[PDB]
Design a protein around this ligand. Structure first.
Ligand code: COH
Ligand code: COH
Ligand code: ACD
Ligand code: ACD
Ligand code: BOG
Ligand code: NAG
Ligand code: NAG
Ligand code: NAG
Ligand code: NAG
Ligand code: NAG
Ligand code: NAG
Ligand code: NAG
Ligand code: NAG
Lengths: 552, 551
């Protein structure tokens, strides 16, 4: 006798509970629905469901009428009202305090309190269910190698029509790997990022012992070295900071930074160097305002400013670019001060899964007159030293990235990574694509052709999975029909955006007792946060101040 | 020296050095402006002219009983008053938290390191010219002289509110799940990383300790049976570490979640009662869900007991302490349309004000016996000799001591009281009057105003010389009590906001948790919402003796 909730019977965020070996009950508290399966809508619910516009209608409005948006963007009262709507509309979607995890399909103190887990937006399918997705489909899911090969692997390179470049692609990797840090000794549902958010541990280190080995202990600064007159991160041998390097890397090329894996990719070392310089620049600025401060307060206040700069850039440059909106997004914590909102966050497993954007990667990495293969590029920081940061920024600003949704664009060099995303999803017992769509208030797909918008890939998928209701989440995100001339389809935006909001606005520095000039050393440090940009980050820290952007 | 050492910024303004001898105050959202945030805005003037004082509000809540008997019996009205009670005291606690013993400015280290107690006021900087900043003498008075002159008990002073030994041991048992000072590191550090009501004193702080305490059948905790009665299991059987003198017999080395609870038979009484309650709730959930396994039975029982604890603490424990005629109510739904943060960090000063040593009697009176402190400490054979029924009947009848009002700390624990003074100073606490302003109370203008009498105030005046450098912890024990009450004003107005955040901030009070299905359905939900100190004893103690927190 299998678990009676295995068919996911309760709808509209109702919670399922076994009441016997072969019976269940649904808890409809505060869903706005009632009945055995929480499918009968209450009166006000009927009215609310007739005035709600679709995600695709709202997307259409924000990506047209540029003349009307140019008006709106220059009326501050109107701009804050719309940005307030953008923030609050996606609030109700994330459980906070968090609930489930890979080991707990019911709420428990272990799931609430153990920070080594990723949390879960949907609870896992129970261990004794008759099929992998519950009751639907066949006894085993299709071979992941067949899924990968038929609809995921890149044939010809498909460029992103939104114009994303390699500055964007490496910013994504650098930024997200402060909170996606899987503890593979324990398993794919466990994390080593116990801060669960934007704490900049990828610059300063996750533990105090690592931070102190990275710090200079003069003027608040981080340790550094000088090569050819340029400032780079220090070495492993000088700091005793542990890093992951193949055994053939020379000691002088073993750079030491907050995140142990950033020596793997020269694009990650580019941003690690930029942010190290930015920290020491802000220390210089704070010392001129506060000659009376000691090393500890200079260091700590610089870190808070850089956290604020990160959130500012991610909202007003990074998300702004991804969105495609004509409306100008705004980082303004005061918009939430009269709203109900929880200043806390727990990183969800499914946020990690949807962020596996590996179609972004090009076939070769083009710097100046060179075209490096994957094998030449990995673990080779000599390329950074040979070319320099100015040439990296100028080259990466010009090279187009790949399109993520729309199918068949994962580079063959990382085919094993893509296969692992499928296999670990199943290992963690994820529910199906259509279950996740309902969870985020989207209509379930009725066919594979509806999923993809074409015929050839959908027919491959139909032969593999047979029922659209057992299609898996992660391959679906990469084959989904994209928005018109966009990098993503609907499922990626509507799942990614609420997770992202909580991680940015949930930071304590956005709470009322923190969001004050004195928190950042007075008005001068505050203004650094509120004027930050990807362009100013590069201009202040890269020789020659080259122009840059997240688009080609 | 640091230019902020005089604490110049008022009304919750934040001070920042701007040079070697200059400061600026940040008045953001205080409702005041000006160099020291002392000039009120217009709306602030009107708000300040309607706010009644805490002593006026207390008078209202402890009189007019005929009016409160109507209020208490019309649910719409009762919830309206309780909603005001909760939201009035909200704006006082920083949440997310801010300062700690090592950081007088906000920092990512202070926010993220859970091994610190947080701080409601920042510490006095290390280079200030006097211990309290700039006022007073170069050294505070000798802590032994303060202790002896105004703290030590002469004759036993009973609590006029009628608090008993069931109350006093419940206070000790309950608070020592979240006051767990890490003396390896210092008085500003804690070992309770949950920072609240997680019942680690029953289940253990770590998973390794929890699994050693669990039976792994039917969700239950391990136990032993001595003379037909259920007690906690032994150290030798579970391999769980406890603090015991080496001379304790093997079967009296009880193992429970908190390593120090073998110290007092009164703490083992509650440890035994709560262990029985967990295994009782497992029995109930097993009959409701024959399909459930051991892991889900254990976890659901723990959530149910957390709710029982919060319910009892609000409606029996705080209800007794308050003295109010209005019946407080535990109802998370009252906050669902309010702004409120479901999180908590334990404050050092909350630990400090909770050192209620004067509650302890001169002897512990059980059946026909009167035990001294030396006979009572570490002696669980007393619990077995008399039994739990007799413990409850005796402790319900024995009066506790008055906490405020002076000269009532028993000599047997004089070293604990001294350490509270000394560690206050080590942690660089600001003064009584600074804490009073922080919680919107008028500063005291003389020692006589603080105590309401003459003899203690003159001793204090010769010792401290300036009322503005009087210290927080000794002041709470000499303060003039409310009329016929156990506490004075400072204790209630600092203690109540800390206490609210720790109870209502629990995740089980948030909307996504506060549902029947979280607790195994309606039968488990009802266990929380009907819990009482009387029913806790009635369900788990042979004979169902009557009990109460008052004599
Ligand atoms: C955000 C976009 C992004 C980019 C540009 C990127 C760029 C690259 C890149 C080229 C520079 C290479 C060779 C890799 C290769 C990897 N990536 Co990514 N990855 C990216 C997103 C991710 C995410 C998200 C994870 C999961 C991180 C984890 O949990 O620690 C990841 C994990 C990995 C892993 C380990 C997980 C596993 O396979 O189980 C490898 C290997 N990768 N990645
Ligand atoms: C809530 C009231 C209450 C009661 C009835 C009570 C009853 C008793 C009691 C009677 C049998 C004895 C011998 C003690 C003895 C002690 N108590 Co209390 N204590 C109480 C409140 C506290 C608090 C609060 C602390 C600090 C806890 C810590 O941080 O671990 C404490 C700590 C202690 C310590 C540790 C010293 C330190 O510096 O923290 C000793 C010893 N004690 N206590
Ligand atoms: C903390 C994580 C930040 C990185 C996540 C970035 C993108 C997630 C995926 C898709 C989002 C794409 C476009 C954003 C759409 C709307 C903006 C919502 C504003 C907010 O929600 O603020
Ligand atoms: C639910 C909280 C609402 C506050 C109730 C209103 C007034 C409080 C009345 C009396 C409290 C007396 C002293 C406070 C000192 C410590 C807090 C004890 C409760 C706890 O150990 O937590
Ligand atoms: C309980 C033992 C405390 C006495 C130790 C010496 C402290 C002397 O303290 C004195 O005690 C007198 C007797 O109570 C009081 O009348 C005086 O006001 C006080 O100064
Ligand atoms: C009232 C109602 O719609 N009940 C349905 C039942 O017909 C269906 O068999 C079950 C599937 O689990 O979901 C529920
Ligand atoms: C325990 C304590 O109070 N301070 C410690 C310090 O001794 C140690 O050097 C540092 C490194 O992690 O961690 C902290
Ligand atoms: C690391 C992991 O996945 N599970 C661990 C297990 O190894 C350990 O026995 C248990 C006791 O603390 O803690 C958890
Ligand atoms: C917390 O701070 C203490 C005191 O500096 C330090 O010893 C300890 O390592 C810190 N804890 C963490 C998790 O960094
Ligand atoms: C590493 O990069 C350098 C460019 O400085 C290049 O000359 C060399 O061939 C590369 N090594 C590998 C293994 O690709
Ligand atoms: C502010 O307070 C300081 C005390 O440090 C006092 O000297 C100064 O006069 C005050 N300024 C105003 C405007 O009240
Ligand atoms: C969290 O859970 C993991 C897996 O059970 C366990 O190994 C680890 O000890 C737990 N962490 C804590 C702090 O209990
Ligand atoms: C412990 O308690 C028992 C009463 O059960 C008493 O007879 C015995 O003398 C006590 N031992 C001490 C050291 O008080």
């Amino acid at each position: 006798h299998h678990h009676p909730c295995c068919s996911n019977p309760c709808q509209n965020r109702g919670e399922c509970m076994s009441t016997g070996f072969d019976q269940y009950k649904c808890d409809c508290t505060r869903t706005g629905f009632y009945g055995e399966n929480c499918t009968t809508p209450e009166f006000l619910t009927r009215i609310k469901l007739l005035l709600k516009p679709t995600p695709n209608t709202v997307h259409y409005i924000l990506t047209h009428f540029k003349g009307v948006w140019n008006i709106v963007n220059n009326i501050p009262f109107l701009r804050s009202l719309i940005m307030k709507y953008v923030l609050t509309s996606r609030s109700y979607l994330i459980d906070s305090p968090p609930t489930y995890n890979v080991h707990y399909g019911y709420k428990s103190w272990e799931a609430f309190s153990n920070l080594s887990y990723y949390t879960r937006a949907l609870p896992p399918v129970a261990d004794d269910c008759p099929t992998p997705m519950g009751v639907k489909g066949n006894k085993e899911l299709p071979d992941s190698k067949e899924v990968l090969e038929k609809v995921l692997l890149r044939r010809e390179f498909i460029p992103d029509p939104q114009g994303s470049n390699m500055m964007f692609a490496f910013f994504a990797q650098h930024f997200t790997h402060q909170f996606f840090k899987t503890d593979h000794k324990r398993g794919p549902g466990f994390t080593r990022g116990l801060g669960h958010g934007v704490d900049l541990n990828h610059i300063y280190g996750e533990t105090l012992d690592r931070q102190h080995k990275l710090r200079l202990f003069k003027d608040g600064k981080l340790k550094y070295q000088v090569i050819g007159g340029e400032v780079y991160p220090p070495t492993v041998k000088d700091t005793q900071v542990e890093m992951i390097y193949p055994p053939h890397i020379p000691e002088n090329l073993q750079f030491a930074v907050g995140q142990e894996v950033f020596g793997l990719v020269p694009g990650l070392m580019m941003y690690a160097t930029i942010w190290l310089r930015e920290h020491n620049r802000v220390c210089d600025i704070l010392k001129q305002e506060h000659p009376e401060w000691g090393d500890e307060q200079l260091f700590q206040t610089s870190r808070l400013i850089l956290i604020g700069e990160t959130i500012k850039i991610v909202i007003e440059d990074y998300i702004q670019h991804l969105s495609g909106y004509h409306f100008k997004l705004k980082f303004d914590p005061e918009l939430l001060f009269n709203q109900q909102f929880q200043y806390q966050n727990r990183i969800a497993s499914e946020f990690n899964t949807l962020y596996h954007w590996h179609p972004l990667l090009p076939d070769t990495f083009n710097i100046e007159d060179q075209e490096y293969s994957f094998k030449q590029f990995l673990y080779n920081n000599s390329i950074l030293l040979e070319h320099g940061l100015t040439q990296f920024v100028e080259s990466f600003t010009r090279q187009i990235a790949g399109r993520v949704a729309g199918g068949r664009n994962v580079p063959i060099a990382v085919q094993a990574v893509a296969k692992a995303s499928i296999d670990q999803s199943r290992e963690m017992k994820y529910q199906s694509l259509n279950e996740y769509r309902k969870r985020f208030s989207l209509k379930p797909y009725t066919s594979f052709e509806e999923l993809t918008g074409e015929k050839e890939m959908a027919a491959e998928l139909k032969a593999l999975y047979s029922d659209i209701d057992v299609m898996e989440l992660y391959p679906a995100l990469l084959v989904e029909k994209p928005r018109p001339d966009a990098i993503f389809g609907e499922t990626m935006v509507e799942l990614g955006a609420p997770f992202s909001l909580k991680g940015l606005m949930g930071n304590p520095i956005c709470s009322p007792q923190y969001w004050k000039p004195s928190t950042f050393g007075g008005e001068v440090g505050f203004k650094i946060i509120n004027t930050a940009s990807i362009q100013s980050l590069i201009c202040n820290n890269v020789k020659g101040c080259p122009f840059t952007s997240f688009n080609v």
